[PDB]
């Protein structure tokens, strides 16, 4: 579980993202697909071009899951259990790809909220996204 200081920073940052969560996560997914084209092969069923309704819809869902995580930092395994089964068992997502999406979430937050994105906030958000990624890949134990 995240340290107290990191939990505080993550909840502060997420509160400042506010209603921009779905737009920012959709942008993070676009950044991942553009920068790391290997990741596109998990979404052959989507239109991945800019302005994609499927990517926008998906960003909203992923943003909702991250909002749930920020509310359940002490029980991420249970809060995310169905998503862990989806990503590790059904989809077999390569663990490297969670790093790529986490990096693109940090790029997106840094670009949109530069004053808020201090080195300490960066460190706490990196730890939050690592902990979410660890839970989503837990089947690989």
């Amino acid at each position: 579980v995240l340290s107290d200081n990191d939990k505080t920073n993550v909840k502060a940052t997420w509160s400042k993202v506010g209603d921009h969560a779905s737009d920012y996560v959709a942008e993070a997914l676009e950044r991942m697909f553009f920068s790391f084209p290997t990741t596109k092969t998990y979404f052959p069923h989507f239109d991945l071009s800019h302005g994609s309704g499927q990517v926008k819809g998906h960003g909203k869902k992923v943003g909702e899951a991250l909002t749930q995580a920020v509310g359940h930092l002490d029980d991420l395994p249970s809060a995310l259990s169905a998503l862990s089964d989806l990503h590790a068992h059904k989809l077999r997502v390569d663990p490297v790809n969670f790093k790529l999406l986490s990096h693109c979430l940090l790029v997106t937050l840094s670009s949109h909220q530069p004053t808020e994105f201090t080195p300490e906030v960066h460190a706490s958000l990196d730890k939050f996204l690592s902990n979410v990624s660890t839970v989503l890949t837990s089947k690989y134990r």
Binding site: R31, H103, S110, H112, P114, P119
Partner: protein
Amino acid sequence: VNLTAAEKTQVANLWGKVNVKELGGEALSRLLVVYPWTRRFFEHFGDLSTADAVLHNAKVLAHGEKVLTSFGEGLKHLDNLKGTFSDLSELHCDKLHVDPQNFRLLGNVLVIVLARHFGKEFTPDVQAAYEKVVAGVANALAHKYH
């Protein structure tokens, strides 16, 4: 590295606006804050005991300007990163024994720093070009391990 012609001009245009002193201190200090084991290589720069110590360390900040100046030398020689970074690869691999994974982490932090300063200008397309560049710099710096 294989950049399209459009990506070569995006990379060069953004770099022209970079304050290497401000962003280079920021990049190196963020590496040491976010990935604390990297402090092992800089213990001789004085107090690195806390993030606040890292962020106020005059030597870490000055060193970061050197690192970004060297990245800018890469940008001038995208067709020959191996040669441009030969000497530095020897230093980091043969003298310092820095694990080359860390080169990728510093490139990650540089992309984040560019995004912070350039905002809406650091579009997904401009990021993707920089991702190719920092991957190529990392691979080049790791050459003496190969």
